[PDB]
Amino acid sequence: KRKGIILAGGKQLLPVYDKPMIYYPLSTLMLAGIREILIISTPQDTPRFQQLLGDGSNWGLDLQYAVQPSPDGLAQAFLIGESFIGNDLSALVLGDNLYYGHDFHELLGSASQRQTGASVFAYHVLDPERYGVVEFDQGGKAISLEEKPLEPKSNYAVTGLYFYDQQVVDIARDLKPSPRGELEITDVNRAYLERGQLSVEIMGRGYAWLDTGTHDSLLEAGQFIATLENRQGLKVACPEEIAYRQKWIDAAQLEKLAAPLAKNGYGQYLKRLLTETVY
Amino acid sequence: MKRKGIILAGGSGTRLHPATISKQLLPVYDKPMIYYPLSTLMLAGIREILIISTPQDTPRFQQLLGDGSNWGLDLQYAVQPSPDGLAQAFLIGESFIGNDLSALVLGDNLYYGHDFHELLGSASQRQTGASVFAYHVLDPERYGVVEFDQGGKAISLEEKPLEPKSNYAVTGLYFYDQQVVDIARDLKPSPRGELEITDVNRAYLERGQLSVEIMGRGYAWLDTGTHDSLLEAGQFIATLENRQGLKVACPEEIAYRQKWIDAAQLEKLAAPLAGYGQYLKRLLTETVY
Amino acid sequence: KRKGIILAGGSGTRLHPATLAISKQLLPVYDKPMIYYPLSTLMLAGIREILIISTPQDTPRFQQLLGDGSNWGLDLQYAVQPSPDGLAQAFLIGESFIGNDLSALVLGDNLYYGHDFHELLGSASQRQTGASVFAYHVLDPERYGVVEFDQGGKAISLEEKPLEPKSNYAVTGLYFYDQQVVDIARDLKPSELEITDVNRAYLERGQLSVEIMGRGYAWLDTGTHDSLLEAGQFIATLENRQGLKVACPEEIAYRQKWIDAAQLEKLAAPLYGQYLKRLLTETVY
Amino acid sequence: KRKGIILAGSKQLLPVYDKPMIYYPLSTLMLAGIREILIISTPQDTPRFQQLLGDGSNWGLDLQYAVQPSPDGLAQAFLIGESFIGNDLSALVLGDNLYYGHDFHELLGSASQRQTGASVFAYHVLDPERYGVVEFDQGGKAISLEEKPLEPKSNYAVTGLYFYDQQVVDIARDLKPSPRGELEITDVNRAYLERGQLSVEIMGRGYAWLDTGTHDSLLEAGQFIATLENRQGLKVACPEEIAYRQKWIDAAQLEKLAAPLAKNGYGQYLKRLLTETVY
Ligand SMILES: CN(c1c(NCCCCN)n(Cc2ccc(Br)cc2)c(=O)[nH]c1=O)S(=O)(=O)c1ccccc1
Ligand SMILES: CN(c1c(NCCCCN)n(Cc2ccc(Br)cc2)c(=O)[nH]c1=O)S(=O)(=O)c1ccccc1
Ligand SMILES: CN(c1c(NCCCCN)n(Cc2ccc(Br)cc2)c(=O)[nH]c1=O)S(=O)(=O)c1ccccc1
Ligand SMILES: CN(c1c(NCCCCN)n(Cc2ccc(Br)cc2)c(=O)[nH]c1=O)S(=O)(=O)c1ccccc1
Ligand SMILES: [Br-]
Ligand SMILES: [Cl-]
Ligand SMILES: [Cl-]
Ligand SMILES: [Cl-]
Ligand SMILES: [Cl-]
Ligand SMILES: [Cl-]
Ligand SMILES: [Cl-]
Ligand SMILES: [Cl-]
Ligand SMILES: [Cl-]
Ligand SMILES: [Cl-]
Ligand SMILES: [Cl-]
Ligand SMILES: [Cl-]
Ligand SMILES: [Cl-]
Ligand SMILES: [Cl-]
Ligand SMILES: [Cl-]
């Protein structure tokens, strides 16, 4: 079994065009076939996520909630989430990451099916210095990770989507804090790399990986999603749809979810899914 | 005679669900939507403001804005139990208005342009009657619509007409004398079952006490009430601010330029925020004409 | 061998006055002419021999921009569509150009983006017989050729711009054909000489492959002021995020090995140019 | 009373949303009441402007064309345009410039009515180092101009709209190339400043002055104009409209222009001008 964690650090309640930002990472985990999900946020925001999503049983999900008292690093998700993870495999997604593209279901599926080691994704960006950066040898094997380097060794940033085996809790517990006293995800990923158990999969230029964490980037992500949805008459990262297509809820349950929203474009969309075949 | 302000940040029901943080708490680029109508009232020289919203949203506005004393304002809060029309602001706000002149602004309206201070100033200085603004739009049937005679005098108002008599919509910014509370009290619900601001404005028109000022095409009046319109407004503000290195509708700036807060107060506001905090600090050091 | 045709048809006065200055398919989508997108699409399919068909007025302007294409390892030719009497007319105008070869037709104002696009074109291109088209879920199918599917997902009807669409699956402006298409086009009667009638002829012989182009691909129309602006913002967002260009023909020629490092360096020097130089030094997976 | 020059150093043929870029500076000169306009461009581009605009008699204009053989600086417009200007006052519209705002007609009118000296506009920008920069004293009087300073003395850039008396040709003739080896408009403006004949008017933050000279800025200008026009049902910088409202063309001339465009939003708009009162 693989359990999911969304870290919504100290924003993920803001809309990207037509739905809350958190619908995107939630939909990402759901596409990977993960239905048991811990949402970690600030003391102030955790209750607001609870109020919005509840226990998730309406979407065939099992949602739980935990607080990050202070932003002491992303790897703190594994300590906060230790009892939630138990003895299971896990996946970690960041709250302000948006993914789009063809074969994304297959790309997540393959990473998810690995019973041992860790899987991350490398994506060519203009500004790699803002992220974890992967260095490759001539043969395309990952040989180094650097967190926000002044002099990036490549243009390949590690995305905010991480797949882990049962070692991650123990690796997180044994992490030496950074000079700033923070538990860094890059140190978790380097631990797997040093054991020869880090799979770095290329996320090709044919995929969109967008940040939604600045005023400018949120606006650009909004326009991007609006253009796709208005062209297609299909929604990106509609959790009700992904639950339906995963068979976690049936036609009758989707109809019940649509009814209260029926006066607006979202409820009308959910109803139309019942009457058309989408390939 | 003092003029008090009302922002009606009404419920949109389930219209913007599931995206809706309430509508007027959503950002237009870099600041909450409510900063725009708040900045509008402040530019008109209004410091005493009632914010009317849903029971669920009222606490979130209070948490964001507080009593407004940090910005030289006196902010109060009231609830609209149900969205039974915009003219209900004058009943909810009756004791707040008391014997004073008033201004009403809608929560999802954005204004921009040169002479906007002068345009508000002139409307605000009228001690009697009411002032509204007429703006040429593509879809007037969505608004209150003004009909003009050959001489350019307003002769009719219609709320959301099937057959608009012009392309001039009344904007969500209204200036009133002490008659508005009494006019609002006598209003009966419209065919749509609402207490309509257009009925308030028609009452002033019939007494020959409605000033309809043209808001020229050189001004931007933007609606932020749909997913699409909010996105367009965001890009519009982003383009202006990134070009100018100046912010549109930064309340701290307007308070400072009105001399409602001094350099020392602005510095105290800037420190905890130190792009927004950096912007507030630059206001202290730069001459902007 | 498979030869390519780009039909950059007249839009009449539809986009005037913006298109009084520059033809529709010469208008930029963010950072490059519209025609770079369909050209790059044919190049990604491995097609090097391409006929560009346009109006009498616009054909010379395409020639002035692109020349014979030898700079990009291409063989570009030009022909005129006297009047916009239908898309199937490309096969009559292009008859002697096509000769005895397989063909592909792309429309001038169609933009494609997505992962596996090289593989999707590759598979369609490798079919030596019949025709291949792509079906894409759209909001407004009534604007396009519309595919009807049976319960088993087999294509059973095509209708051009139906009042009552039988699905939300539009046929995209990208078509792969065997040696039958010229003969089918010759026998077509006006409805315009419609590409949907060509595709239905292949369907009736059981030789039409309708591949689903999934929602994970972007198929954008650039034929209105609004749609061109949206396409511009879409490409700008991808390119500024990635530090990579969409549909840069020099890059696709280089990665296809149609031009070498020395040829790319010669193209970069007079110039976009900084981007071409970076291609020489960086491994992009 | 005043002749116009558009220096188009091609960029100015590209559309800003729904019309060629050059419609914007042309509409600007027309709003100032200028009907006699010289378009200066490269040998290659001058014919393309001629093909688009012709002699301008359709819009009640008198359009002429001249070539800049080599890009030796924007002040060369006054040498190339010397015989065109003759003994008249002039206005120059330079760069890839878009203007919008309330009182713009009045702002141009006032600058235009000055019978002596020169008038320029100063606008607060984020990146003044890209432009001519105005320094002000404590009393707000202009005291220095610098072309693209490394250390700008203010955030006030001089816009690409210049009003000149009959001295400009003689000042241009006496100019020597700058360190960058160009005849610079800033040197023309400084000559007027030194003789106490430069009026620097503030263009307030309530006006939009947009650059359309990069891929990014052209896209942003497109979205800006699209937002205004689709909101208002009114067009920005439609030359036919400005000619009609200036009474340079009559209803019969406007009808002839509108009919061939009538199946699109532009011709429908020109027809609406015949029947509708817009204040
Ligand atoms: C745009 N995509 C997207 C979808 N396509 C995936 C195509 C299936 C493989 N042929 N499906 C269909 C879908 C089909 C089967 C199943 Br089981 C689940 C979902 C949706 O329901 N919602 C989507 O939003 S996505 O890029 O993969 C994605 C998804 C989620 C967040 C972010 C991005
Ligand atoms: C963009 N404008 C705008 C400003 N300009 C006003 C023009 C100067 C008068 N000559 N000032 C300066 C300003 C100067 C003096 C005083 Br007292 C108050 C404010 C700001 O501080 N913030 C602004 O945001 S605005 O269109 O009028 C507007 C304003 C508010 C909401 C919406 C729209
Ligand atoms: C965005 N893509 C895109 C690319 N990706 C394709 C990735 C295949 C990797 N296995 N390549 C790389 C590329 C790699 C190998 C070869 Br041989 C040719 C080109 C480019 O050079 N330019 C591109 O622009 S695209 O969607 O396929 C496309 C392409 C053309 C027009 C429109 C859209
Ligand atoms: C948006 N404006 C704009 C207009 N407003 C001016 C309002 C004056 C009210 N007293 N008029 C009306 C107009 C009215 C009377 C006469 Br005579 C000429 C033109 C237009 O016809 N076209 C416009 O496009 S503008 O900012 O000045 C401008 C103008 C040009 C380029 C860029 C920007
Ligand atoms: Br990492
Ligand atoms: Cl986050
Ligand atoms: Cl790819
Ligand atoms: Cl289905
Ligand atoms: Cl009204
Ligand atoms: Cl105006
Ligand atoms: Cl045509
Ligand atoms: Cl086309
Ligand atoms: Cl569509
Ligand atoms: Cl078809
Ligand atoms: Cl897909
Ligand atoms: Cl200057
Ligand atoms: Cl101003
Ligand atoms: Cl550029
Ligand atoms: Cl149009």
Residue numbers in the entry:
A (entry chain A): 2 to 11, 25 to 293
B (entry chain B): 1 to 20, 23 to 276, 279 to 293
C (entry chain D): 2 to 192, 196 to 275, 280 to 293
D (entry chain C): 2 to 10, 24 to 293
What does the paper say about this structure?
RmlA, a glucose-1-phosphate thymidylyltransferase, is the first enzyme in the pathway and catalyses the condensation of Glu-1-P with deoxythymidine triphosphate (dTTP) to give dTDP-d-glucose. In addition to the active site where catalysis of this reaction occurs, RmlA has an allosteric site that is important for its function. RmlA exists as a dimer of dimers and is functional as a tetramer. As a consequence of its structure, the active sites cluster at the dimer-dimer interface and the allosteric (or regulatory) sites cluster at the monomer–monomer interface within each dimer.
Based on the initial success with 1b being a sub-micromolar inhibitor of P. aeruginosa RmlA, it was decided to extend the length of the linker unit from n-propyl in 1b to n-butyl in 1d and n-pentyl in 1e in an attempt to position the terminus of the C6-aminoalkyl chain outside the allosteric pocket. In the case of 1d and 1e, a primary amine was incorporated at the end of the chain. The increased length of the linker chain in analogues 1d and 1e compared to 1b led to around a 2.5-fold increase in potency with 1d and 1e having IC50 values of 0.303 ± 0.026 μM and 0.316 ± 0.023 μM respectively (entries 4 and 5 vs. entry 2). One highlight from this structural study is the demonstration that for inhibitors 1d and 1f the terminus of the newly incorporated linker unit sits outside the allosteric binding pocket. This provides a real opportunity, in future work, to attach a siderophore to the end of the linker unit with the goal of potentially increasing the bacterial cell wall permeability of this class of inhibitors through the ability of the siderophore to be sequestered by the bacterium. The terminal amine of 1d and 1f could provide a possible site to attach a siderophore, laying the foundation to prepare bacterial cell wall penetrating RmlA inhibitors.
